Amino acid sequence: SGFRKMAFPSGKVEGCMVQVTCGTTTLNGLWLDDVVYCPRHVICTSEDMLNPNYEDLLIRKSNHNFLVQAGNVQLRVIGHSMQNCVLKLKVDTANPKTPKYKFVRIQPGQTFSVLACYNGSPSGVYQCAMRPNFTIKGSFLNGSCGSVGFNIDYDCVSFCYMHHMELPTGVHAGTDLEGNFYGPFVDRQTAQAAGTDTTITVNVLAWLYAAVINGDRWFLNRFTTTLNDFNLVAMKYNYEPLTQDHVDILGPLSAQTGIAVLDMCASLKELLQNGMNGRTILGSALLEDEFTPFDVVRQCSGVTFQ
Amino acid sequence: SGFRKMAFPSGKVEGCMVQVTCGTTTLNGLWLDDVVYCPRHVICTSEDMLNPNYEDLLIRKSNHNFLVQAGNVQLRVIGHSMQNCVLKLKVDTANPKTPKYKFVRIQPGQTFSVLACYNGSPSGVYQCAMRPNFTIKGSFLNGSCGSVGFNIDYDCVSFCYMHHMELPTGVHAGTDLEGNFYGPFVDRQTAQAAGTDTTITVNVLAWLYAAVINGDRWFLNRFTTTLNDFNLVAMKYNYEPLTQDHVDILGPLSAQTGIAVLDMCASLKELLQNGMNGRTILGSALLEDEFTPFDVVRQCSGVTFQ
Numbered sequence: 001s002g003f004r005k006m007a008f009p010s011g012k013v014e015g016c017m018v019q020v021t022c023g024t025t026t027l028n029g030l031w032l033d034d035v036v037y038c039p040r041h042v043i044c045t046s047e048d049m050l051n052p053n054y055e056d057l058l059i060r061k062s063n064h065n066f067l068v069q070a071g072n073v074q075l076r077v078i079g080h081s082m083q084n085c086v087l088k089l090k091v092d093t094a095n096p097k098t099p100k101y102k103f104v105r106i107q108p109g110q111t112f113s114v115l116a117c118y119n120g121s122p123s124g125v126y127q128c129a130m131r132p133n134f135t136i137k138g139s140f141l142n143g144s145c146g147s148v149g150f151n152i153d154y155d156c157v158s159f160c161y162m163h164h165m166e167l168p169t170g171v172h173a174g175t176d177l178e179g180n181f182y183g184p185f186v187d188r189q190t191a192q193a194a195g196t197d198t199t200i201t202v203n204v205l206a207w208l209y210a211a212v213i214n215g216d217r218w219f220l221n222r223f224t225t226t227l228n229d230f231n232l233v234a235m236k237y238n239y240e241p242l243t244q245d246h247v248d249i250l251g252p253l254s255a256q257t258g259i260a261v262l263d264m265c266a267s268l269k270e271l272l273q274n275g276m277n278g279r280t281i282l283g284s285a286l287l288e289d290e291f292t293p294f295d296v297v298r299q300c301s302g303v304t305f306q
Numbered sequence: 307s308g309f310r311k312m313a314f315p316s317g318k319v320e321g322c323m324v325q326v327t328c329g330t331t332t333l334n335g336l337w338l339d340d341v342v343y344c345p346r347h348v349i350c351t352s353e354d355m356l357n358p359n360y361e362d363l364l365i366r367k368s369n370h371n372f373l374v375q376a377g378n379v380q381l382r383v384i385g386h387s388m389q390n391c392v393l394k395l396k397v398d399t400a401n402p403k404t405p406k407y408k409f410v411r412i413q414p415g416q417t418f419s420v421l422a423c424y425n426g427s428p429s430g431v432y433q434c435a436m437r438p439n440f441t442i443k444g445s446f447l448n449g450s451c452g453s454v455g456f457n458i459d460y461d462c463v464s465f466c467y468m469h470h471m472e473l474p475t476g477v478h479a480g481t482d483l484e485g486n487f488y489g490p491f492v493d494r495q496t497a498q499a500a501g502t503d504t505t506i507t508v509n510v511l512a513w514l515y516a517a518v519i520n521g522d523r524w525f526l527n528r529f530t531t532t533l534n535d536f537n538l539v540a541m542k543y544n545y546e547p548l549t550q551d552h553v554d555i556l557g558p559l560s561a562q563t564g565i566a567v568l569d570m571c572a573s574l575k576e577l578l579q580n581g582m583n584g585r586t587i588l589g590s591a592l593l594e595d596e597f598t599p600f601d602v603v604r605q606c607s608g609v610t611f612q
């Protein structure tokens with residue numbers, strides 16, 4: 001028993017991280033086959049970041065202006081291109097540690113592990129969620145750029161996130177591996193509105209099912225509700241509306257615990273309307289929404305990788 | 307900026323995990339050089355676990371009764387010995403992925419990353435602390451045994467924990483890599499008292515310094531206190547007493563933030579006496595004690611490994 005905010009084992013991603021240097025700028029790159037992927041703002045100076053014309057900047061750069069280092073050894077860059085907000089550096093050697101991999105663009109609410117790196121070396125690994133407003137609440141310092149978020153499935157790594165930017169409000173924004181930002185954000189040192197964040201209702205419900213599985217169930221109430229009635233309460237407390245899809249996805253946890261989804265919704269309703277009243281759920285004094293139903297099933301059944 | 311419960315990159319430990327089978331029992335082993343380390347209760351049946359004579363049980367076993375599997379390949383066991391509560395299986399092949407490593411016995415309050423494994427394959431990685439009462443609040447299912455906790459320093463892995471047991475109260479207990487349990491616990495299916503847990507005061511203080519570094523500082527009060535006066539309040543709320551050692555260890559965070567330790571103690575005092583009043587600190591509605599001062603400095607300065 002027990003429930004932790006568990007990250008994927010990082011080993012497969014560790015072997016892909018490299019350092020990319022251009023001018024005075026250094027950040028992390030992801031080396032897969034004979035391509036290195038990194039944020040295109042590697043080509044910028046602090047001055048350029050105010051208002052970069054990335055086309056104009058990249059034109060000044062040649063293959064040899066990109067130093068890629070994997071440990072001690074230099075990779076030779078024989079080609080470069082800009083796809084959206086990422087730079088693709090073709091190198092002459094294939095990464096011998098390349099895992100089976102996909103690029104995926106995940107939906108709001110989904111979760112992944114971040115491998116936080118500096119100078120192409122990992123510092124740590126943590127689990128986080130793509131917020132409804134397409135930001136993440138990560139842990140990123142100067143030089144963290146190029147760090148990636150990912151999911152593993154048996155032996156296949158699914159890369160979903162590359163870190164590009166901390167907003168003025170201290171929250172984090174980035175792209176998929178095709179370099180398309182999550183959300184409205186641009187790679188420019190400018191004030192940028194993230195917009196209203198919302199709580200990921202289905203994830204909270206998943207986490208409540210986790211709590212019941214692990215014996216924590218004081219919050220189970222005598223009430224039920226409807227999807228509409230619940231949603232009225234959801235909008236008030238800045239929760240995402242609950243669909244039959246979300247209800248369907250919770251089916252397994254409902255089947256394992258014998259608690260109907262709408263009964264758990266009623267319990268959740270009461271927690272929102274009355275607060276948690278000084279008590280805790282799975283060591284938390286607030287409603288956690290960083291666990292997808294899939295995360296709960298993974299953790300509580302001990303699914304393995306490699 | 308931002309602050310996460312970050313685990314170490316697990317890659318170096320992934321390459322050490324193996325499956326150990328004896329009779330019908332299977333659990334995780336740690337393969338370092340030509341030795342595999344695993345819990346000695348691998349030799350038990352469900353019946354034996356009530357009251358095992360480990361000496362008597364092990365005597366019935368020979369080298370060939372231990373199947374060690376690293377992926378597809380079998381390791382050949384050419385020797386076995388019992389050190390305290392761990393079994394050491396000498397194998398004929400050295401692990402080619404052996405990292406630079408130490409065995410350390412950590413103190414209460416210190417932190418480490420757990421790599422949760424099943425059948426010698428990792429499921430996930432999370433950060434936790436050795437509770438003052440020598441338990442850990444982990445995430446462990448049947449078959450999780452042999453899973454290890456560790457710290458990394460540049461390229462050296464320091465193994466501090468091997469998982470052996472979930473207590474009836476759903477908390478977790480284990481040994482160092484020399485097989486000596488943390489705390490009073492024995493490897494027997496019996497009711498076992500963990501004793502009163504306490505909050506790791508120095509870690510809470512560290513985390514408050516982290517909070518100030520990351521702009522969260524509403525909790526900063528107008529008051530100061532003494533070490534004695536603070537400690538009086540500490541004992542009341544089940545906090546560990548604060549020593550000059552702990553004050554000394556917080557020095558760096560005090561120097562970075564310009565907040566004297568005893569002023570932060572006063573702030574902490576007020577949070578304990580008045581509660582958090584519906585507000586949050588670094589996304590938490592309670593006082594986190596799983597971050598050592600070293601963890602805070604690591605995270606907030608982006609220290610790397612490999």
Ligand SMILES: *C(=O)[C@H](C[C@@H]1CCNC1=O)NC(=O)[C@H](CC(C)C)NC(=O)c1cccc2cccnc12
Pocket residue numbers: 027041049140141142143144145146164165166167168172186187188189190191192307
């Ligand atoms: C990447 O290495 C670095 C990571 C930042 C630095 C502080 N924490 C992080 O997560 N990114 C940048 O250098 C980045 C460049 C963007 C504009 C492409 N700049 C920012 O992340 C950044 C920092 C502070 C304030 C603002 C405001 C607007 C845009 N970007 C900002």
Ligand SMILES: *C(=O)[C@H](C[C@@H]1CCNC1=O)NC(=O)[C@H](CC(C)C)NC(=O)c1cccc2cccnc12
Pocket residue numbers: 001333347355446447448449450451452470471472473474478492493494495496497498
């Ligand atoms: C290891 O694979 C397994 C992990 C346990 C199983 C449930 N979650 C875990 O963390 N350990 C055991 O099989 C273990 C054997 C001990 C006695 C050496 N038994 C327990 O961990 C266990 C489970 C429930 C209740 C009790 C009560 C007393 C002792 N051990 C218990």
